[PDB]
């Protein structure tokens, strides 16, 4: 599948180099001509948006399959989601870094954000109820995502380096993020 | 001054590579033999700690010089200090990135942390009064600094890429950081 090879190649290149990764380099590492990349993605912006949703879907498969939903308290559910996302990101550091590079890019469309939210309805509902309004807004969502992902990456880095304390770092990082980004 | 040249070469190398930066490379980039580096710094860990204090001293010179001394409210003082620090880091991205790499390395000693905050007593006193106790503890201070510096660098990134909203990024990032780290 040329498209799957392109998505994997875009993941690695955008993780490494951000959205400034050129469509010509992505094509080469996928083993195809650049016109072939545009054969599957009309523009680079479409590739950015398609890749983002592809990576979010991969993450969400882990978040949802793992979700202990004997849980109805929102913060408890979010802690579980956080823990699962930490595990996913440590297992897939390039996929996680690509999500972060794409999320802070301001290239993601309204349709992409809507589909992203709707892929995981329980998470969506909690974010709309609890995240500070400015960080769900079109104007500042990318900044809210940037702050969230900065705290997530720091938590992952410390957990990876000091596994004896990993559970404590993950808990403290979740709690700091929760205070920073949510309101009662 | 080869000590200053070594500190500058160490700043750029550690900003790029973290504390894995090679002392042979730092010495070569300062134009001296590697053994000359160790005449100025007894060990690589001492270089790490001295450089951290050197860069924190530079930052604090701006923080202290800029601080409005008529402000007595702790949070408002910290908002001013945050803004001054954002300005300094945007003007000196390698120095700030080196501080971040050194802070999260866990190679900074308790004494170095003490000497660091003693350079800016107003900041020191506010941190001890307001930061969550876990993030002032020896065991989790490096993580507290990592969270702080992650929010700081994200704020700098957005203010630099979208300067038309710099004041809003700086204010939103401060409040997020403040809620993350204080009680
Ligand atoms: C550790 O990394 C993650 C952990 C959880 C998620 C799921 C998620 N996506 C978007 C916004 C989120 C916002 C959250 O809280 C504000 C949150 O708390 C668990 C999870 C969120 C994504 C993650 O990275 C993309
Ligand atoms: C934007 O970058 C900075 C801004 C302020 C400072 C000063 C400072 N140093 C250590 C811990 C700090 C912790 C703070 O709040 C918890 C704080 O609020 C203004 C400033 C802090 C350092 C900064 O980077 C090293």
What does the alpha-carbon distance between residue A105 and residue A143 come to, in Å, rounded to a whole number? 10
Where are the domains positioned within chain B? 1-183
Tokens of A179: 């205070």
**Bridge partners, residue B131, by sequence:** B182
3-state SS, residue B131? strand
Closest listed residue to residue B61, CA positions, set B117, B119, B125: B119
Work out which ligand 2 atom sits closest to the CA atom of B79.
Answer: 19
Between the CA of B81 and the centroid of ligand 2 the distance, in Å, is 7
Between the CA of A176 and the centroid of ligand 2 the distance, in Å, is 16
Mutate to test the pocket of ligand 2, among B57, B62, B64, B82 (most ligand atoms within 8 A of CB): B82
The maximal CA–CA distance of chain B, rounded, in angstroms, is 50
Tokens of A48: 């950015």
Query: Tokens 């995502």 correspond to what residue?
Result: A145
Experimental approach taken: X-ray
**A13 CB-near residues (< 8 Å, 6+ apart):** A21, A25, A26, A29
Measured between alpha carbons, how far is residue A44 from residues A20, A22, A24, A170, B154 in Å?
10, 9, 10, 35, 25
Ligand 2 close to Cβ of residue B131 (< 6 A) = yes
């Amino acid at each position: 599948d040329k498209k799957q090879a392109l998505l994997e190649a875009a993941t690695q290149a955008i993780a490494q180099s951000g959205i400034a990764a050129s469509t010509a380099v992505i094509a080469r590492n996928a083993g195809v001509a650049e016109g072939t990349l545009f054969r599957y993605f009309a523009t680079k912006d479409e590739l950015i948006n398609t890749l983002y949703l592809h990576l979010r879907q991969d993450l969400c498969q882990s978040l949802i399959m793992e979700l202990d939903r004997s849980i109805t308290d929102a913060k408890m559910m979010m802690r579980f989601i956080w823990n699962s996302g930490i595990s996913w990101g440590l297992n897939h550091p390039a996929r996680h870094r690509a999500i972060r590079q794409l999320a802070v890019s301001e290239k993601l469309t309204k349709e992409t954000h809507q589909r992203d939210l709707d892929m995981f309805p329980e998470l969506r509902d909690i974010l709309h109820r609890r995240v500070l309004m400015v960080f769900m807004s079109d104007e500042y969502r990318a900044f809210g995502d940037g702050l969230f992902l900065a705290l997530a990456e720091t938590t992952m880095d410390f957990a990876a380096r000091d596994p004896a304390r990993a559970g404590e770092y993950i808990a403290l990082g979740f709690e700091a993020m929760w205070r920073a980004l949510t309101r009662e």
